[PDB]
Every structure is written in structure tokens, then in C-alpha cells.
């Protein structure tokens, strides 16, 4: 029927003066654009069909052509930034926003999807969708007593589009829009569908990727406990965005980090720091490094949860990037920690793996490590135990590596190594 038309047949049908023929040709276009392999997006655009589709969006008396044109434009807008720009230039934004109030659920959903792609293109189109007033009707679609009464796919598409309205930076979304969206986002963050939860955590992670004021906008809504709960979920698509959100939050002030700690987040990190997925381990170690860079009572919270041995483990064996985040965590620990806490750090066996990591080719990890060593040596000086530490470093081959780093081409590297040698290995 409408399977595998040519673009010229589609153009001939859409340019006819017969609404029904236009509907058939539009459906044919939709089917061309929804095939598995290589849809002819550029050919459809070059045929000049976008304005016709946009005009079909407004044909209230023929909802089928509204749906087919909405679907076709959706799939065009799903492509490159140039194709999405083609959809926007046709005036599609206000038309889709108008369709958000359609009495037909599938048409309204299709509009939600299209706006999701357009806004998902980038900060500019995101802000333009917002300027046309999409947030009010979008959120109105979710103003029901119980989200479970909505269709699963409907709710999933709404959540996804909203998450795209929270996505991208330079600039971040307008503050007023984020405040307008955040309550519904909190509501979705408590829904029982895994995809709604994943997309909600992603949206929160977007909103927390920024200055402390944005982080505060999120944290003030009281979502941290829920974020920890989801951090303990079994579905990796949930744990990943939840962990990213937590990390972002702990990049903020010590009080926000403290709200993460009070929610019980640390209790989850024994598993996260041994998670079989590399990215979970890396992001968890990065989060930890942003915790050990905080107050001494917070470092002490890290200690009490038994997470220092897990850091020693990651530093001993893990993907190199995860090991680098571990080195950062150690250097922050030693920078802000007390003498007792640094002593405890050595008692857990940090020295040997820390030394082994000096044979890495990455310059910055060598710098980080040498700073950590400097700090530990400072604690030893404050305890008069520097000799024993020098012996520790010498028995595991660390002294050889430092002495060799004296010949390292980087300035700060061979500076720090020279200082360590002449000050503690004479």
C-alpha cells in the first residue's frame, strides 16, 4: 500500500489537491523514514516536504495526517543538527506544542517525541522550545493523581523529553524553567518503571552538573535519599545516572556532600568500588575522591565505613583511569586528613601500590602520587617516624622509582622527586 514509495511519488501525492491522497503520500514518507537501514532524510528534505508536513500538523479535521506528519517530522528531527534545523526552520515547534493538547493520545505523544528530539539537539533549540512555551503543556500532561494510570510508553517519552529539556550546558537551562520542571521530576523519580527512573536520574545528573547554585536547586528538593536508594538498584541503567548525580552533588560545598553522606551513600561504595562494570568503578572512585577532599569529619566518615581498604584495592588493581581517580582520592585524603588518618592510610597498605603506580607513563598521576608521598612524609615528620617510612618506600622499590624520576623531563616531577630524595633519603 504505502510501502517503499519513491520520493517522487510522495511529492506527487502531497502536491495533489486531495487531502486523502496527501495522507497516503505522507504515510508513505513516514514508512520511508522509519525503516531500519538509512532512511532518506536528506532526500525528503531536498524535496521540500517539511513545510507541507508542518501544515498537516494543523489539520484538526484529519487527525491521521496529523499523526503521520508528526511521525515523519519526528524522524527527520532525530538526525543531524542540520536536519533538526530543517525541521525547526519549517515552523514545527509551535505546531507540535499546539498538538500537545490533542485529544488523541498517540498524536500528543508524537508531539512530545518530536519536541524531545528538537530540544535534544542542543542548548539553543532547547531554549527556543522553552521560549515557545512547551513546559506548561508538557507538565500538564503529567498532572494526574497517580502516574500509573498513564501508558508506560507515554510516560517514558514524556520523561525522556523532560530530561532533554534539562540537558546540555553553555548555557545551562534557564533557572526559571528548571524550577518549573523540578517538582514533576521529583515525582517521576519515585515511579516504579525502570526507564522512567533511569531518565529521571539522568535529568537530575544534568541539573547537578554545574555551579553550587544549581546543585543547591536540586538538593533543596530533598532528592538525595532517593538518589542513594536508586544508587543501590540492581539495574545498571539506573545505578549509572544515580552515581553520576551523587558525584556531581559531592563536587559542591561540604554541606551538600554532607547531605549525601547523611543519606547513607557511603554504605553502597564497597560494592560500587568493586563493581564489575569499569565505568561504575571509575565514577565511584571519582566520587570518593570528591569526598576525601572535604572536611576531616567527612574523611573520618570514609574511614568508619571501611572504604580505605577498597581504595587500596582499586589503587592495586583496576582500569588505569580508575587507578588515577584513586590516586586523586589518596592525595586529597592526605592533603585534608589528620595525622591519625594518614597513619591509618599507611597501615592499610597504600604505600606499595602507590609506588607501583610511579612506573606509569601518565605525568599527572606521577605528580599526584608525589604530592601524596610529600603529605605522608609531613605526617611522619610530625610523628618523628620519617625513617620508617623511607624504609617502607625503599623495601618495595619505590626509592628506585623516585630517584629515577629525578631524571624525568617534566619540571615539577623531577623537582618533587629531588626534594623527596634530598629531604628523606640521605
Amino acid at each position: 500500500g504505502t510501502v517503499n514509495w519513491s520520493v517522487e511519488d510522495i511529492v506527487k501525492g502531497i502536491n495533489s489537491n486531495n487531502l486523502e491522497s496527501q495522507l497516503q503520500a505522507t504515510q508513505a514518507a513516514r514508512k520511508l523514514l522509519s525503516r531500519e537501514k538509512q532512511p532518506p532524510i536528506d532526500n525528503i528534505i531536498r524535496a521540500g516536504l517539511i513545510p507541507k508536513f508542518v501544515s498537516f500538523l494543523g489539520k484538526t479535521d484529519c487527525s491521521p495526517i496529523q499523526f503521520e506528519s508528526a511521525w515523519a517530522l519526528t524522524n527527520i528531527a532525530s538526525g543531524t543538527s542540520e536536519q533538526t534545523k530543517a525541521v525547526v526552520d519549517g515552523g514545527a515547534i509551535p505546531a507540535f506544542i499546539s498538538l500537545l493538547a490533542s485529544p488523541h493520545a498517540h498524536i500528543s505523544e508524537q508531539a512530545v517525541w518530536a519536541l524531545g528530539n528538537i530540544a535534544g539537539d542542543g542548548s539553543a533549540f532547547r531554549d527556543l522550545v522553552i521560549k515557545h512555551g512547551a513546559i506548561d503543556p508538557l507538565l500538564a500532561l503529567l498532572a494526574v493523581p497517580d502516574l500509573s494510570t498513564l501508558a508506560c510508553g507515554y510516560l517514558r517519552n514524556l520523561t525522556w523529553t523532560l530530561s532533554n529539556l534539562c540537558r546540555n550546558k553553555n548555557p545551562a537551562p534557564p533557572l526559571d524553567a528548571v524550577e518549573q520542571i523540578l517538582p514533576t521530576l521529583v515525582r517521576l523519580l519515585h515511579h516504579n518503571d525502570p526507564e522512567v527512573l533511569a531518565d529521571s536520574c539522568w535529568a537530575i545528573s544534568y541539573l547537578t552538573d554545574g555551579p553550587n547554585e544549581r546543585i543547591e536547586m536540586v538538593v533543596k528538593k530533598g532528592v538525595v535519599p532517593q538518589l542513594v536508594k536508586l544508587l543501590g538498584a540492581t539495574e545498571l541503567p539506573i545505578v549509572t545516572p544515580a552515581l553520576r548525580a551523587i558525584g556531581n552533588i559531592v563536587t559542591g560545598t561540604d554541606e551538600q556532600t554532607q547531605k549525601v553522606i547523611d543519606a547513607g551513600a557511603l554504605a553502597v561504595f564497597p560494592s560500587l568500588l568493586t563493581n564489575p562494570k569499569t565505568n561504575i568503578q571509575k565514577e565511584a572512585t571519582w566520587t570518593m575522591s570528591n569526598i576525601t577532599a572535604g572536611r576531616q569529619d567527612q574523611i573520618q566518615q570514609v574511614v568508619n565505613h571501611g572504604l580505605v581498604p577498597f581504595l587500596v584495592g582499586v589503587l592495586s588493581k583496576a582500569d588505569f583511569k580508575t587507578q588515577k581517580e584513586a590516586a586523586w582520592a589518596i592525595t586529597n585524603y592526605t592533603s585534608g586528613g589528620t595525622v591519625e588518618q594518614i597513619v591509618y592510610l599507611v597501615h592499610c597498605g597504600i604505600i606499595e601500590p602507590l609506588m607501583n603506580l610511579l612506573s606509569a607513563k601518565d605525568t599527572k598521576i606521577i605528580q599526584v602520587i608525589l604530592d601524596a608521598i610529600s603529605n605522608i612524609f609531613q605526617a611522619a615528620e610530625k610523628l618523628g617516624e620519617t625513617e620508617k617510612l623511607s624504609i617502607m618506600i625503599e623495601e618495595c622499590g619505590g626509592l628506585d622509582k623516585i630517584e629515577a624520576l629525578q631524571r624525568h623531563e617534566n619540571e615539577s616531577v623531577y623537582k618533587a622527586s629531588l626534594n623527596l630524595i634530598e629531604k628523606y633519603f640521605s
Binding site: 522509519s34 532512511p39 532525530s78 517525541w113 524531545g116 539537539d121
Partner: peptide, 8 residues
């Protein structure tokens, strides 16, 4: 991960 979805 990509932010756009093609409806197949």
C-alpha cells in the same frame, strides 16, 4: 549517549 530517538 545520543539525545535524539528515531521512531522505528
Amino acid at each position: 549517549f545520543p539525545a535524539k530517538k528515531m521512531k522505528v
